[PDB]
Design a protein around this ligand. Structure first.
Ligand SMILES: *[C@@H]1O[C@H](CO)[C@@H](O[C@@H]2O[C@H](CO)[C@@H](O[C@H]3O[C@H](CO[C@@H]4O[C@H](CO)[C@@H](O)[C@H](O)[C@@H]4O)[C@@H](O)[C@H](O[C@H]4O[C@H](CO)[C@@H](O)[C@H](O)[C@@H]4O)[C@@H]3O)[C@H](O)[C@H]2NC(C)=O)[C@H](O)[C@H]1NC(C)=O
Ligand SMILES: *[C@@H]1O[C@H](CO)[C@@H](O[C@@H]2O[C@H](CO)[C@@H](O[C@H]3O[C@H](CO[C@@H]4O[C@H](CO)[C@@H](O)[C@H](O)[C@@H]4O)[C@@H](O)[C@H](O[C@H]4O[C@H](CO)[C@@H](O)[C@H](O)[C@@H]4O)[C@@H]3O)[C@H](O)[C@H]2NC(C)=O)[C@H](O)[C@H]1NC(C)=O
Ligand code: NAG
Ligand code: NAG
Ligand code: NAG
Ligand code: NAG
Ligand code: NAG
Ligand code: NAG
Ligand code: NAG
Ligand code: NAG
Lengths: 190, 207, 207, 190
């Protein structure tokens, strides 16, 4: 068996509704045709279509003016020869700026030396979000931490500096996993 | 009256997913009684079409059978037979994926030295040469984006005066602005052809 | 039934001495009763031709008036009117030497860098571009000898996706042996066109 | 008025039947089409046809395998634009090797210092040629001297060295001015 090509979003994969990101696939260089899909309702459908070979780089897409339309499961499609069709493992995108900014806060100071713990409490008092996800800047993926209890109890354990920088937190509902709240207030952990 | 049969088009074969193939009977001021019979049966069913009132007294009538994308690629000989609302003897044609091939040789060639000096618009050329059936597809690319067909001009395939092996040739021109060329971004020409193993084949250009 | 009128050809105009011009009536299973009337009279007399049994039920019939080489060049509007062995109303056409022009821009371009290294046969290209009516003539030359038409391939004129002014374009390829090119002798491409003042215009090539 | 273009034969314009020469015209560079004619019977007819412009040299023809067919009046034809037709002054060509070599001879020695005269006597005893022409080598033209009396009385007057080198003599009839006898014996005047 095989791996199947990779799917990356070189810039953090969550964007303000109307945001722009630089999505990227792997490059089967014996495949002239490459199709970005969004697995939408029982199926998958063509959004963008980049033809050609890549005996150099890997293929990038760009989603600009990020829509509620543009959020969901994204997958690459490779066409080799006249019958070979190779997929890619799935990626998802999600928008921000929809519901209302939650607010987050600390139990200790903004520069906790991590030998001991820090929990962040994130919640909204007037917007009954199904779940909350705590979003670090930079790191190019769906958040490390997500919960669905009435206070967002996200501690960090004994931190270490690859857990540092700027942090925020987003709301989330049941059937809009692709649609998230506004960005909250920022946490400059150092 | 005459009958002709039309192969699937590389356009629909490579950039698409619905090769039709067309058997069209031409002329005889007929009610288009007709009736068409085809080779790969059952699988998909054949469809007749409107008596597209061909000029003069022909009134041509056509047939397609959709979905025949896979039997073309496994060679398999296709037949069409029509017995028409006139008289005599029914007419029949047959084709298949052509035997002998000959991969294209593709060459993207530079703007004129004397034209690029006069920094305005200049000419990229693309040359498909010595290949199998005349049917080809040439698509241009800027950076890594397919330009709409309307931005570049492509001539058709024509037999070249060849020594022995009867081979075809095609040319294409993309006229572009000089600032793009001296700037440094990348253009490409790509040729798709029945023979070619990877379907299309890309060759690029810098300066 | 339809009537079309055909202009003199640059081939016969420039390399010859007998422009005909052809008014041909097409289709209607007729005895070709017909009758044709023309503009410059008397001078030379008009000639009808055989009902060249056009496919289907057309049986097309044609006309020429020889010697009209000088009235074409002094513009002068030509008319043809035919009243046919059917019914209704006679048919008529008219042409003349086209108004707006636009001289060709001609560019003879080199063999591929990657093809000439493999010293065998390589490709000379010739590009006629942005010109007046689509009708052109491209003739290749070795040293100072006209190669027979059969040694070089010329595509036809086709409108290029142009900004505003609707202009045409033509390409040509002469495949030649490498030893001739590295040896040092001279090749040329020449384009004749209605607009161009000296009729043809030559542009040459060395390496 | 005008001159009208020139006609030259860069190699001596008389050739053994089956001989080859490098005929040359002048080059009107506003004339794409150039037509070598042979004014044959009341008219003129196309032999060779060289197309193109000459913004460099002047146009040359070549007549190889010189025929009785290929002897006569030769003239260039220039086509400028769509109605201008400019000619060229006429040239003639003549063949050799047809009748029988005459024989020539001297009255003094083969190196006459020219202060005083030398006459050459050229004739045929068995071939009643209409006239005789005495042909010097090199010099690119129809001979300086031609006569039609029963001895070829060709003296040179007080010679001078541009009259020196190799000389021969040819027969000639009435209605074959283009058709001449074989080359005679050679005179190495020094
Ligand atoms: C059965 O399969 C046959 C295949 O032969 C199809 O018949 C062919 O149908 C295609 C339609 O895709 C015909 O092309 C027509 O559309 C072309 C579209 O060009 C557009 O270009 C813009 C770029 O600005 C692009 O954005 C558009 O999306 C689109 O691509 C158009 O170019 C064609 O005209 C060209 O072709 C003719 C014929 O050579 C040429 O004379 C013209 O000058 C022009 O260059 C045309 O409008 C295609 O012509 C036709 N096949 C033939 C042989 O003509 C059927 O559609 C299929 N039927 C079913 C039921 O599946
Ligand atoms: C009235 O004037 C018309 C002008 O339209 C003439 O009709 C045209 O007649 C010419 C004849 O000169 C037709 O061309 C035919 O002969 C071509 C000769 O090619 C030869 O090439 C060799 C080189 O190996 C050369 O040595 C020969 O001396 C000769 O030049 C031949 O190429 C033509 O076929 C081509 O043209 C068709 C049409 O486009 C094309 O589809 C073919 O594939 C091929 O490339 C042809 O056999 C010319 O076609 C024709 N006009 C049209 C529009 O077709 C009449 O002859 C004139 N009649 C009178 C009474 O004066
Ligand atoms: C998807 O489509 C299927 C049938 O087309 C339908 O049953 C279903 O409700 C649609 N929605 C989802 C979320 O699957
Ligand atoms: C890279 O691939 C292209 C085909 O797209 C080919 O022309 C080129 O030779 C390849 N590069 C190398 C170093 O082989
Ligand atoms: C961090 O949390 C763990 C889990 O309860 C606990 O064992 C540990 O003592 C905590 N560290 C502190 C409070 O410094
Ligand atoms: C909340 O998370 C912190 C982090 O370790 C932990 O100390 C505490 O027990 C958790 N409580 C609940 C109710 O989840
Ligand atoms: C030339 O042709 C004319 C008429 O065509 C004829 O009278 C004459 O005899 C021919 N011969 C010569 C030498 O002029
Ligand atoms: C010589 O004439 C040619 C046209 O045949 C032209 O392209 C070229 O510029 C001319 N040479 C010069 C120095 O002008
Ligand atoms: C050469 O001939 C002339 C002409 O008769 C004569 O006057 C002259 O004396 C001659 N020269 C000689 C014989 O040296
Ligand atoms: C022959 O020519 C010579 C050359 O001057 C001359 O002396 C002599 O008088 C001439 N005689 C005749 C008969 O021509």
């Amino acid at each position: 068996n095989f791996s199947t090509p990779f799917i990356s979003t070189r810039s953090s994969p969550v964007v303000p509704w109307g945001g722009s990101v630089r999505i990227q696939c792997q490059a089967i260089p014996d495949a002239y045709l490459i199709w970005l899909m969004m697995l939408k309702n029982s199926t998958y459908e063509k959004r963008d279509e980049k033809l050609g070979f890549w005996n150099d780089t890997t293929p990038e897409f760009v989603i600009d003016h990020m829509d509620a339309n543009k959020a969901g499961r994204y997958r690459c499609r490779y066409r080799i020869g006249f019958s070979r069709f190779r997929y890619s493992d799935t990626l998802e995108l999600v928008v921000t700026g929809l519901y209302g900014k939650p607010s987050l806060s600390v139990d200790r100071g903004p520069v906790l030396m991590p030998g001991e713990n820090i929990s962040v409490t994130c919640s909204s008092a007037h917007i009954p979000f199904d779940r909350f996800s705590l979003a670090k800047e930079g790191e190019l993926s769906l958040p490390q931490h997500q919960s669905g209890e009435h206070p967002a109890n996200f501690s960090l354990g004994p931190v270490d500096l690859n857990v540092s920088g700027s942090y925020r937190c987003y709301g989330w509902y049941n059937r809009s996993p692709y649609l998230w709240s506004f960005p909250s207030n920022a946490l400059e952990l150092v | 009256p005459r009958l002709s049969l039309r192969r699937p088009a590389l356009e629909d074969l490579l950039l698409g997913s619905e090769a039709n193939l067309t058997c069209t009977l031409t002329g005889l001021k007929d009610p288009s009684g007709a009736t068409f019979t085809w080779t790969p049966s059952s699988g998909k069913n054949a469809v007749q079409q409107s008596p597209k009132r061909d000029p003069c007294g022909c009134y041509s009538v056509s047939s397609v059978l959709p979905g025949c994308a896979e039997p073309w690629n496994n060679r398999e000989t296709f037949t069409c037979t029509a017995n028409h609302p006139e008289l005599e003897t029914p007419l029949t044609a047959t084709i298949s994926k052509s035997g002998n091939t000959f991969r294209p040789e593709v060459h993207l060639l530079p703007p004129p030295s004397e034209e690029l000096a006069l920094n305005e618009l200049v000419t990229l050329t693309c040359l498909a040469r010595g290949f199998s059936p005349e049917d080809v597809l040439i698509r241009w690319l800027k950076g890594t984006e397919q330009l709409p067909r309307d931005k570049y001009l492509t001539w058709e395939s024509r037999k070249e005066p060849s020594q022995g092996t009867t081979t075809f040739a095609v040319t294409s021109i993309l006229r572009v602005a000089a600032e793009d060329w001296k700037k440094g971004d990348t253009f490409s020409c790509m040729v798709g052809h029945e023979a070619l193993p990877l379907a299309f084949t890309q060759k690029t250009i810098d300066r």
